[PDB]
């Protein structure tokens, strides 16, 4: 059992439910439900999020460590040193080499492959929820919208659409099915991540009308302008990005095979600057 | 005494100074006595690491001269600086070849070591060719070709397909084919042949050289994947 | 006019009474209301003693653009009108741009419409004037359109003032707000939804839709069924937008409202912006001539409904 | 559930049950029971080891990833790049700065504190089972002897003593109780680890008689020569080492008190590279 | 022309050639014209780098020569290396002081600049005194003492408690008290005082140097916790 | 004597017929047995055709010391005696020092004692001679003591040869083996257990204890109870060692063995090494004079018991 007896956790600073840097057997991240009277809906949210994390043990999933109930509802996870992919790409504009960008793609795919393999749909994959831990290891986090695929079609019921629009698949936006989420919707989000990785910018930078983007993407009018990929982007990546971004969700493959395609554009993808001469004896 | 000289050179190698080291090793070879296996790698490291440091200067100065694309004293100065460091580059390599073809090539006992010295002088000639463009380029290229056509024979005769030295000769000779002569078919074919051969005796890998062997191996694979693109 | 002049004078004097603005300078009194991307607090600015509304908008933004947002908000210091909520200052702390503004103790017409059920055509007349003058003010003296007109953005007070708020003054803030969470409804004009057109003509539509919402006391978009109109799971936002774009505009019920009012909202809600009445045309409208001339204890109606 | 369906794992090289470098959603470590007919004793071993790992999620415990049954019995864990503490200290004699050594102590303690807090006694803690992952993070591994403390004294029964002698506490060696293991026995092992860290050598280097060491340590005659600590070793560490090594088990501190001390040892020492002059811009 | 010299020095700084970039700047200062804010940092950094290099070279060399605890040619002719790098160390610092007391300390266009050059003078002379153990040290220790006191007066007068230069002077003067004079009580008092007055105007941290100010601040705290421990 | 000479001749012949040794050179025939840190395989050395015993001892060791172990084992090339198992060569591959030695198809007296239950005093006489000569050989011609005498380390063959094995020839290998797993019993002399003394006198004790084990067919440590001796959970090793150190030595049962035999083992098992008989004294012992002079089909007894 993963319930942390009250008192042990030592909440500190704030970052962005709500997330604090705390203390419990070292630096940890503490995500709290600030309020005092947890509605049974916020309760099932918590129960569900914990339920999903419990099933994850993989180096590219951010490490769930335990949960607390008594003070406030909270989820404890490993602390990360270093920034989100969002922060690298759009804030400090880190000048990653293309081999690194490909590798970030690769690892992100690795974590997603692992989740889908246990039937977890993340539902909120995006730059911000991808952390470059120690600048070397991609950890996918924030499982606040994560869910496990039910074998039965009538368990679903009604959930108010939430999430960041730039990563939402057209079918999700449209919200016409009982359940428009699928492994494929996660792929689309990862598609937008490829976009940020291969271009350096978010999609639709000329449009600042929020409702317009929701409407035009859901309708099919609007889709990312793939011409904005930087010139050092391997052709295989551009293709792979366009494939993850297909409007017809089924036009998408599984992430195990997606990484297989990411392994395709990798062995001959790079060998660094120039080459290397006779290796001096140590 | 020789041992004071080799301890002085080794100590200066530990201090990341490659001028007193090269002077001490030139003073070693000027005695005209035959080296060991150990005393040789120090000489190659001194005249090799310093040469690499000199090269990096040439590469970045030449890039800063092909990125300016104007007509002023900035690139006037670049040339005045490029010919300066190139002449410095020329003086070092001529000192190496003069120290090499007068005490070591003829005065050697190990055939592996004789092949090694041919790898060293040939690599130096290839490096000289990879920068001097004009009438003087032809002779350096011919010397590099002669070095390649003599070390490769003894490698195919009396070496292992998994030895470090034969692998290093294959590596340097392949990058010679790719950069100097620009025939990537032949150099690429040679690299493929090396991959087919170096694989054969993978079982025959003793502790004396595993790190070197696999290091040249992955370098060979990286050059291959660069060139087949 | 004299009352409005006195109000402006007081605002300016209080502005001179205070100096710099920063997070330590404030004490929280109460939470006036909140939403997907912003929160509003009734606060007491400690140095000056002033009670003001403090709006926090969460944004993760580069220092260079946060400073550009602040600098662009400083234009509000000059925005002086009785149809425009007053501005005390702006700053960035922690993870949030703060806008400090004239506290309006009456609230937003959104809050009011909840307690009042439906707003009387005669009060809406005053509101319609207030909106037009304010949109005119913004347009002419500050080169800008509102962008976001709707009941929650018209604020009213004890002295009977109706002011506009949350308009698009900082262009950078507009840009930074585009990365946003999904709303639950919309007042956006169809031509904007289609990227076909962009002008004050679009703010006119939103006023139109607002009015219908405030008149009927429900939503101007997705107008009720035959039964539902007798009394007097929510449609997803994409469906709302698709409606606005592809369906006829909403309209006022037949008998309960004057023909002048029905005609007024109608010329505000014409799908094609070209054929849609403009501020000059609306200003001399039958409904506006009438309402202007009417005298209504607006301030009285307001306090009586709270 | 953590059972990995057969076929997915791709066993490769060997390292040292038996451990291979394999493949399953990236590089992993695969620890197999080579044989073909698993005795019900080897079976309960496996069941128990998996049982313990399942309860661990902490950055200083080596990451259990899942287990396989069908091909052979196997435990899959994260792969580590980089060497064991044993390898650094006694093979490549890595010249760690004292602040680093203290930090390795600190992290090792952190992982142990976490295990004891969930009532797991490791029972085979030693240099080899402490990995400096990416040279920066201590991961404690090998839970082949790990066990969970039973509330009831009669569940124990008979287990043949196994383990490396240099890290075995005198009471464990003597093996007089039904259950001579305790949190305190783990501390003693960690005590020997402090010894390797603060001295650079294993204990009893003058003695090469295996049975003699077992006999002399169990009897009280033999104990580590603390004089061999290097001179840069903070006095607080030497004391802390001698305390973890006390012969009377109850006299040994537990891991919070260990982490309570260790944290202060870092604050009671100028662990700042070497000095601090002018930082050129 | 000055601009050819500064482009040559900047180009050599891009090529990671310390001495190369460090020359051109001596030719700049030999003209005897007053520098800007920008032209000072480049030369300063070059000088600092050269100093550090020589320092390590002798220090590491000296330590290795004194870590053989025997009696042989190791710490004989091999150790003569310490007097070699020490003489090299001496030549650099004498070139600095000759370039300093003849074109820069005579006329000051900025008083903060006067604090800068006096801080550099205390840095060089104190290092030379630490390097030479014998009759020479008494002189340079007092010379650095006068230089740092002269800088400390102008720092206490007309500087900010959050400026980089006053922080750097406090840092160098504290490590001078700890290493050269070995009175860690006054160094502890000094660093604690400088750190506490550094806290006061934490709000007054413009984009010009928040990073420098807090960087020297945490370095000061680290030196304090080393010396008080 | 002539037979042993011919055997040594054949050994040297096969030695010269071979050269270097390495892991590829070998084909596994069968597993002859395993211990605490080592494994032994009957193998066929491919180049020479020779069948030999290959012992692998797992060690994680520096190249400099592995090479020192090999180099020190090369001294066995000269160790030529009919009381000493023959040596073909040594090497290191993967993670394991290999010692290649004379295959003894009779096995260890440990293996034999399992099938034979008890070994007849008359055979043990031959064994006692073999051990003494071998310990003498090692001592005088190679300056070394065995260190590890016990039933599993005396090997016997079809030709009736009794040879010693696993003795301490490489000093470095001794050192490298000290980091070891715990045994289940022990034949170590008490004076060694106490670090009080270290000589051949200690190998004599172990021979003594071995003999008692081989005679009675059980374990020398902890003797046997009154009932158990009529027929004819294991004590933990620390307890065994504590016994050896603090209790009287074991001894042979009263009637079943000759007084000469009982006296012989007794002088081997005296706690104080000083008072303990040495190789010279043991060699001229009543039990040895008798047994030497006796003629026993040892080779015959061996094959008949297998
Ligand atoms: N200056 C103010 N004076 C008084 N009340 C205010 C002020 N600003 C905001 N409020 C209250 O806070 C609530 C939030 O409304 P706004 O601040 O206009 O945000 P909003 O209109 O909800 O925008 P969205 O859709 O949530 S991003 C309203 O119900 C107002 O009554
Ligand atoms: N040359 C050999 N020929 C045939 N069998 C051998 C040979 N060498 C060893 N064996 C057998 O291999 C097993 C181990 O014998 P040893 O090598 O002497 O080790 P040990 O006596 O078991 O001591 P421990 O328990 O490993 S400390 C025994 O069963 C031997 O009979
Ligand atoms: O406030 C805004 N949107 O609502 C937040 C969602 O909750 C808002 C939106 C856009 C904008 C462009 N320039 C300023 N802008 C705003 N602010 C604002 C404007 C005028 C006044 I007077 C007071 C204000 F706070
Ligand atoms: O073999 C050994 N111990 O047994 C392993 C545990 O299973 C052993 C132990 C110590 C030793 C020192 N020098 C060699 N040493 C050994 N080897 C050995 C010696 C002589 C012969 I002839 C054949 C051999 F293999
Ligand atoms: Mg608003
Ligand atoms: Mg043995």
Q: Across the interface, do E223 and D278 touch by the CB < 8 Å criterion?
A: no
CA distance D124 to chain A (A): 22
Mark which of A78, A102, A121 sits at the end of a domain: A78
- The whole-angstrom separation of Cα F186 and Cα E128 is 68
Q: Are residues F98 and F112 in the same domain?
A: no
- The whole-angstrom separation of Cα A168 and Cα A218 is 9
A243 domain-assigned: yes
Q: Are residues D142 and D37 in the same domain?
A: no
CA E78 to ligand 5 center in whole angstroms: 79
* Best residue for ligand 1 mutational test, from C152, C168, C176, C302 (most atoms within 8 Å of Cβ): C152
Show residues of chain C in contact with A218, CB under 8 Å: 238
- Cβ neighbours of D223 (radius 10 Å): 15
Q: Where are the beta strands (DSSP E) in chain F?
A: 26-34, 38-45, 51-58, 87-93, 96-102, 107-108, 154-156, 162-164
Q: Are residues F88 and F203 in the same domain?
A: no
What are the φ and ψ backbone dihedral angles of A133, each rounded to 5 degrees?
Answer: -70, 130
**Full residue range of the structural domain in which residue A70 is found:** 18-78
Contact C126, C120 (CB under 8 A): no
- From B168, which residue of chain A is nearest by alpha-carbon distance? A278
Residue nearest to ligand 2 atom 23, measured at CA: F35
What chains are in contact with F, requiring at least 3 Cβ pairs below 8 Å? D
Q: Are residues C70 and C151 in the same domain?
A: no
The CATH number assigned to the domain holding F89 equals 3.30.200.20
Residue nearest to ligand 4 atom 17, measured at CA: F166
Q: Across the interface, do D63 and A57 touch by the CB < 8 Å criterion?
A: yes
- From A106, which residue of chain D is nearest by alpha-carbon distance? D26
Q: Across the interface, do A162 and C182 touch by the CB < 8 Å criterion?
A: yes
**Full residue range of the structural domain in which residue F38 is found:** 2-102
- Selecting from E45, E219, E226 the residue whose C-beta is nearest the C-beta of D270 gives E226
Contact C44, C29 (CB under 8 A): yes
Mark which of D41, D60, D78 sits at the end of a domain: D78
Q: Across the interface, do A281 and B44 touch by the CB < 8 Å criterion?
A: yes
Q: What's the full length of chain E, in residues?
A: 229
CA distances from residue F287 to B113, C134, F205, F259, F302 in whole angstroms, order as listed? 66, 127, 16, 9, 21
Q: Is C278 a catalytic residue?
A: no
- The whole-angstrom separation of Cα D260 and Cα D279 is 34
Residue nearest to ligand 4 atom 19, measured at CA: F166
Structure tokens at E188: 């502890």
- The whole-angstrom separation of Cα D220 and Cα F154 is 34
Q: Across the interface, do F193 and D219 touch by the CB < 8 Å criterion?
A: no
H helix or E strand, kind and range, residue D67: strand D64-68
A250 domain-assigned: yes
CA distances from residue C127 to C122, C286, D21 in whole angstroms, order as listed? 9, 15, 75
H helix or E strand, kind and range, residue A131: strand A130-133
Ligand nearest to the CA of C72: 3
Q: Is A31 helix (H, G, I), strand (E, B) or coil?
A: strand
What chains are in contact with A, requiring at least 3 Cβ pairs below 8 Å? B, C, D
Q: Are residues F77 and F137 in the same domain?
A: no
Edge-to-edge order in the sheet of strand F26-34: F26-34, F38-45, F51-58, F96-102, F87-93
Closest atom of ligand 2 relative to the F102 alpha carbon: 1
Q: Are residues C58 and C114 in the same domain?
A: no
Ligand nearest to the CA of F187: 2
D225 domain-assigned: yes
Q: Are residues A186 and A201 in the same domain?
A: yes
H helix or E strand, kind and range, residue D74: strand D74-78
Contact C121, C258 (CB under 8 A): yes
Q: Which of D200, C38, D59 is nearest to A134 (CA)?
A: D59
Q: What is the DSSP string of chain B?
A: --HHHHHHHHHHHHTT--SHHHHHHHHHHTT-----SHHHHHHHHHHHHHHHHHHHHHHHHHHTTTTT-S-SHHHHHHHHHHHHHHHHHHHHHHHHHHHHTTTTSSS---HHHHHHHHHHHHHHHHHHHTT--SHHHHHHHHHHHHHHHHHHHHHHHHS-TT-HHHHHHHHHHHHHHHHTS--HHHHHHHHHHHHHHHHHTSS---GGGSHHHHHHHHHHHHHHHHHT-
Q: Which of F38, F293, F42 is nearest to F181 (CA)?
A: F38
D223 domain-assigned: yes
- Selecting from B123, B175, B228 the residue whose C-beta is nearest the C-beta of A268 gives B228
- The whole-angstrom separation of Cα C173 and Cα C97 is 9
Contacts 24+ apart (CB under 8 A), B21-24: B21/B46, B22/B46, B22/B47, B22/B50
Measured from the CB, is residue C87 less than 6 Å from ligand 3? Answer: yes
* Best residue for ligand 3 mutational test, from C169, C172, C178, C186 (most atoms within 8 Å of Cβ): C169
- The whole-angstrom separation of Cα C176 and Cα C60 is 9
Contact F262, F122 (CB under 8 A): no
Q: Are residues A129 and A198 in the same domain?
A: yes
- Relative to beta strand D130-133, strand A18-23 is unpaired
Q: Across the interface, do B78 and E7 touch by the CB < 8 Å criterion?
A: no
- Selecting from E8, E60, E78 the residue whose C-beta is nearest the C-beta of B8 gives E78
Contact C202, C148 (CB under 8 A): no
CA atoms within 13 A on the CB side of A97: 7
- The whole-angstrom separation of Cα D110 and Cα E15 is 46
Contact F176, F32 (CB under 8 A): no
- Selecting from E212, E222, E229 the residue whose C-beta is nearest the C-beta of D276 gives E222
Mark which of D41, D56, D78 sits at the end of a domain: D78
- Relative to beta strand A27-32, strand A120-121 is unpaired
C5 domain-assigned: no
CA F76 to ligand 6 center in whole angstroms: 17
Instruction: Report which DSSP code applies to A50.
Output: H
Contact E58, E86 (CB under 8 A): yes
Binding-site residue set of D for ATP: 15-19, 31
D27 domain-assigned: yes
- The whole-angstrom separation of Cα D260 and Cα B21 is 51
The CATH number assigned to the domain holding A249 equals 1.10.510.10
What value, to the nearest 5°, has the Cα angle with vertex A16 and ends A10 and A17?
80
Structure tokens at B135: 């009438």
Q: Are residues D69 and D146 in the same domain?
A: no
D94 domain-assigned: yes
- The whole-angstrom separation of Cα B144 and Cα B180 is 10
The CATH number assigned to the domain holding A46 equals 3.30.200.20
- Experimental determination approach used: cryo-EM
Instruction: Resolution in Å, one decimal, please.
Output: 4.9
Q: Are residues D105 and D60 in the same domain?
A: no
Q: What is the residue whose two structure tokens read 């193998």? A: F43
Number of domain units in chain A = 2
Q: Is the dihedral of CA D204, D208, D210, D211 positive or negative?
A: negative
- The whole-angstrom separation of Cα C249 and Cα C269 is 6
The catalytic position among C148, C203, C263, C278 is: C148
- The whole-angstrom separation of Cα B86 and Cα A37 is 77
The CATH number assigned to the domain holding F291 equals 1.10.510.10
Q: Is the dihedral of CA B19, B21, B22, B23 positive or negative?
A: positive
**Residue F125 labeled ligand binder:** no
CA distances from residue A149 to A43, B52, F192 in whole angstroms, order as listed? 20, 58, 69
CA distances from residue C99 to C12, C72, C145 in whole angstroms, order as listed? 17, 12, 19
Mark which of F62, F79, F102 sits at the end of a domain: F102
Q: Residue C162 pairs with which residues in a beta bridge?
A: C156
Q: Are residues F24 and F67 in the same domain?
A: yes
- The whole-angstrom separation of Cα D173 and Cα A278 is 54
Q: Are residues A99 and A58 in the same domain?
A: no
Q: Which of F93, F94, F47, F92 is nearest to F73 (CA)?
A: F92
Q: Are residues D169 and D253 in the same domain?
A: yes
Number of domain units in chain B = 1
Instruction: Report which DSSP code applies to E81.
Output: H
The CATH number assigned to the domain holding B17 equals 1.20.190.20
Q: What is the DSSP string of B40-61?
A: HHHHHHHHHHHHHHHHHHHHHH
Edge-to-edge order in the sheet of strand A18-23: A18-23, A27-32, A74-78, A64-68
For every residue of chain C, which 3-state class applies, written as one string? CHHHHHHHHHHHHHHHHCCCCCHHHEEEEEEEEECCCEEEEEEEECCCCCEEEEEEEECCCCHHHHHHHHHHHHHHHHCCECCECCEEEEEEECCEEEEEEECCCCEEHHHHHHHHCCCCHHHHHHHHHHHHHHHHHHHHHHCCCCCCCCHHHEEECCCCCEEECCCCCCHHHHHHCCCCECCCCCCCCHHHHCCCCCCHHHHHHHHHHHHHHHHHCCCCCCCCCCCHHHHCCCCCHHHHHHHHHHCCCCCCCCCCCCHHHHHHHHHHCCCCHHHCCCHHHHHCCHHHHHHHHCCCCHHHHHHHCC
- The whole-angstrom separation of Cα B148 and Cα B127 is 13
Contact E82, E60 (CB under 8 A): no
Q: Considering only the C-alpha atoms of chain D, give the largest distance between any 2 of them, rounded to a whole number of Å.
A: 68
CA D29 to ligand 1 center in whole angstroms: 57
Q: Are residues A91 and A163 in the same domain?
A: yes
Estimate the share of chain D in helix, then strand, then coil, as percent rounded to the nearest 5: 40, 15, 50
- Cβ neighbours of C260 (radius 10 Å): 16
Q: Does E208 touch chain D (CB under 8 A)?
A: no
Mark which of C56, C79, C102 sits at the end of a domain: C102
- The whole-angstrom separation of Cα B57 and Cα C191 is 61
Binding-site residue set of D: 15-19, 31
CA C83 to ligand 1 center in whole angstroms: 16
Number of domain units in chain F = 2
Q: Across the interface, do E14 and B74 touch by the CB < 8 Å criterion?
A: no
- The whole-angstrom separation of Cα A184 and Cα A247 is 10
Q: What's the full length of chain C, in residues?
A: 306
Point out residues after which chain F has a gap (C–N over 2.5 Å). 232
CB neighbours of E148 closer than 8 A, spacing ≥ 6?
E118, E119, E122, E126, E169, E172, E173, E176
C264 domain-assigned: yes
Structure tokens at B85: 């460091």
- Cβ neighbours of E23 (radius 10 Å): 15
Mark which of C64, C81, C102 sits at the end of a domain: C102
Q: What is the residue whose two structure tokens read 């600098």? A: C71
Instruction: Report which DSSP code applies to E102.
Output: T
What chains are in contact with D, requiring at least 3 Cβ pairs below 8 Å? A, E, F
C173 domain-assigned: yes
Ligand nearest to the CA of C187: 1
**Full residue range of the structural domain in which residue B168 is found:** 1-229
CA distances from residue F234 to C66, D161, D172 in whole angstroms, order as listed? 79, 12, 17
Chains C and A touch (3+ CB pairs under 8 A): yes
């Amino acid at each position: 059992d993963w319930e942390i007896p009250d008192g042990q956790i030592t909440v500190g600073q704030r970052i962005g439910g709500t997330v604090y840097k705390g203390k419990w057997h070292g630096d940890v991240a503490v995500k709290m439900l600030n309020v005092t009277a947890p509605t049974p809906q916020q309760l099932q949210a918590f129960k569900n999020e914990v339920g999903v994390l419990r099933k994850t043990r993989h180096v590219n999933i951010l490490l769930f460590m335990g949960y607390s109930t008594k003070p406030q509802l909270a989820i404890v996870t490993q602390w990360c040193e270093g920034s989100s992919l969002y922060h690298h790409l759009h804030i400090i504009e880190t000048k990653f080499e293309m081999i690194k960008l490909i590798d970030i793609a690769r690892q992100t795919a690795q974590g997603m492959d692992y989740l889908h393999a246990k039937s977890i749909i993340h539902r909120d994959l995006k730059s911000n929820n991808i952390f470059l831990h120690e600048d070397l290891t991609v950890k996918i986090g924030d499982f606040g919208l994560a869910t496990v695929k039910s074998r039965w079609s009538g368990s679903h019921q009604f959930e108010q659409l939430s999430g960041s629009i730039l990563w939402m698949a057209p079918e999700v936006i449209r919200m016409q099915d009982k359940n428009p989420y699928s492994f494929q919707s996660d792929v689309y989000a990862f598609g937008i991540v490829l976009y940020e990785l291969m271009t350096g910018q978010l999609p639709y930078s000329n449009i600042n009308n929020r409702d317009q983007i929701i409407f035009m993407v859901g309708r099919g009018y609007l889709s990312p302008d793939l011409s904005k990929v930087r010139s050092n982007c391997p052709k295989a990546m551009k293709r792979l990005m366009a494939e993850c971004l297909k409007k017809k969700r089924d036009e998408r493959p599984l992430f195990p095979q997606i990484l297989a395609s990411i392994e395709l554009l990798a062995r001959s993808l790079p060998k660094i600057h120039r080459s290397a001469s006779e290796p001096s004896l140590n | 005494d020789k041992e004071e000289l080799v301890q002085r050179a080794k100590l200066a190698e530990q201090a990341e100074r490659y001028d007193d080291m090269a002077a001490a090793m030139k003073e070693v070879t000027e005695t005209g006595v035959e080296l060991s296996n150990e005393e040789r790698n120090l000489l190659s490291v001194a005249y090799k690491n310093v040469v690499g440091a000199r090269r990096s200067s040439w590469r970045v100065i030449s890039s800063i001269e092909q990125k300016t694309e104007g007509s002023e004293r900035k690139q006037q100065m670049a040339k005045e600086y490029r010919v300066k460091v190139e002449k410095e580059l020329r003086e070092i390599c001529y000192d190496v070849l003069g120290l090499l073809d007068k005490h070591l090539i003829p005065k050697a006992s190990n055939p592996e070591s004789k092949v090694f010295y041919l790898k060293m002088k040939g690599d130096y000639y290839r490096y000289l060719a990879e920068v001097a463009t004009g009438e003087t380029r032809n002779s350096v290229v011919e010397d590099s070709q002669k070095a390649y056509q003599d070390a490769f024979e003894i490698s195919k005769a009396k070496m292992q397909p998994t030895h470090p030295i034969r692998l290093g000769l294959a590596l340097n000779f392949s990058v010679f084919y790719y950069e100097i002569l620009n025939s990537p078919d032949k150099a690429c074919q040679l690299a493929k042949q090396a991959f087919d051969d170096a694989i054969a005796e993978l079982d025959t890998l003793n502790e004396d050289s595993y790190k070197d062997s696999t290091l040249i191996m992955q370098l060979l694979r990286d050059n291959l994947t660069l060139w087949t693109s | 006019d004299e009352q409005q002049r006195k109000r402006l004078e007081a605002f300016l004097t209080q502005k001179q009474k205070v100096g710099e603005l920063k997070d330590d300078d404030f004490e929280k009194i109460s939470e006036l209301g909140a939403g997907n991307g912003g929160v509003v607090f009734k606060v007491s600015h400690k140095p000056s003693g002033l009670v003001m509304a403090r709006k926090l908008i969460h944004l993760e933004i580069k220092p260079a653009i946060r400073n550009q947002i602040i600098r662009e908000l400083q234009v509000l210091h000059e925005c002086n009108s009785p149809y425009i909520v007053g501005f005390y200052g702006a700053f960035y702390s922690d993870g949030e741009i703060s806008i400090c503004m004239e506290h309006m103790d009456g609230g937003s017409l959104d809050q009011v419409l909840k307690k009042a059920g439906r707003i009387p055509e005669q009060i809406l007349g005053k509101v319609s004037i207030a909106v037009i003058k304010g949109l005119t003010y913004l347009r002419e003296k500050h080169k800008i359109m509102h962008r976001d007109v709707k009941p929650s953005n018209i604020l009213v007070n004890s002295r009977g003032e109706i002011k506009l708020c949350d308009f698009g003054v900082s262009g950078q803030l507009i840009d930074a707000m585009a990365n946003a969470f999904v709303g639950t409804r919309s007042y956006m004009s169809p031509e904007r939804l289609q990227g076909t057109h962009y002008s004050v003509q679009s703010d006119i539509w939103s006023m139109g839709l607002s009015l219908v919402e405030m008149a009927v006391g429900r939503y101007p978009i997705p107008p009720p069924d035959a039964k539902e109109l007798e009394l007097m799971p929510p449609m997803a936002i994409f469906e709302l937008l698709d409606y606005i774009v592809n369906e006829p505009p909403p309209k006022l019920p037949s008998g309960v409202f004057s023909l002048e009012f029905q005609d007024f909202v109608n010329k505000c809600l014409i799908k094609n912006p070209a054929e849609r009445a403009d501020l000059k045309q609306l200003m001399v409208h039958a409904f506006i001539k009438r309402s202007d001339a009417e005298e209504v204890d607006f301030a009285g109606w307001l306090c009586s409904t709270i």
